[PDB]
Amino acid sequence: IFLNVLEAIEPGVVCAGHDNNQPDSFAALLSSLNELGERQLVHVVKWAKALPGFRNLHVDDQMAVIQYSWMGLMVFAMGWRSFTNVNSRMLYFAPDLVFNEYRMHKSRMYSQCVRMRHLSQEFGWLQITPQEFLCMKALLLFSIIPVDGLKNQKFFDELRMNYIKELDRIIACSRRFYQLTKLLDSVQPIARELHQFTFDLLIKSHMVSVDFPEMMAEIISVQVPKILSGKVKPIYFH
Numbered sequence: 001i002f003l004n005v006l007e008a009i010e011p012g013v014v015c016a017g018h019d020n021n022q023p024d025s026f027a028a029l030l031s032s033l034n035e036l037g038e039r040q041l042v043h044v045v046k047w048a049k050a051l052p053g054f055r056n057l058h059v060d061d062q063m064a065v066i067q068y069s070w071m072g073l074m075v076f077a078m079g080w081r082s083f084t085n086v087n088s089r090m091l092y093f094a095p096d097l098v099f100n101e102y103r104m105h106k107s108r109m110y111s112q113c114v115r116m117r118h119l120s121q122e123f124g125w126l127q128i129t130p131q132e133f134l135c136m137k138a139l140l141l142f143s144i145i146p147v148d149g150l151k152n153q154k155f156f157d158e159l160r161m162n163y164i165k166e167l168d169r170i171i172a173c174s175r176r177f178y179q180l181t182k183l184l185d186s187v188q189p190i191a192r193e194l195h196q197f198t199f200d201l202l203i204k205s206h207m208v209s210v211d212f213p214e215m216m217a218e219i220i221s222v223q224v225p226k227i228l229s230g231k232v233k234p235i236y237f238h
């Protein structure tokens, strides 16, 4: 039942709308990454709200958890796409936005990209199954919260525990749980580096000709700083 649901709600293909019939430029590549980020966020919201037990969360915490975990969720999924679509040879942000090393460099997000490429390879080296991937991604949604607590922390704690239990079941073991939780933990530092880069870019966006969609500008200026200033932190296993 649980896995039937995760498979059923898994987002389909999302395109960036990027113009690949034009020479690469920082401004065009980043505007497309931002646009793709917003397109994916729309799907992450619909995905999250259809997750088993998500409605158990207080209305106020439902949106907060999505916004705080959004980047990490995208990173994990992108890494899986890169692994399955091109065997980690390139970063598969979208069918129309595939990054080779030249683009990783041009984007000025090279360090972050190489770490995501490594994550992509991890899916292969650890022989992560599609089902482990699905359960792990759902768990990512409940892996970062405010130090001052959610409106109803207890309901969140219950749901997160339930998702960890589903992972236990998929695995069923100690050695595998160790590997998977280690992998999950590695996503956070990557999201953090992307958060910092996105924040800095938004602040100077008007100086580099980079367009930020309304919805993205809001999250990056209201939610992301809570994470960067230490008010909202990831829940690490290790």
Ligand SMILES: C[C@](O)(CBr)C(=O)Nc1ccc([N+](=O)[O-])c(C(F)(F)F)c1
Residues within 6 Å of the ligand: 030, 032, 033, 034, 035, 036, 037, 038, 040, 071, 073, 074, 075, 076, 077, 078, 079, 093, 094, 194, 198, 216
């Ligand atoms: C630079 C920025 O546009 C900030 Br939102 C960005 O990180 N976009 C973005 C768009 C899509 C994906 N993605 O589909 O996975 C990601 C990723 F998570 F890779 F880093 C990032």
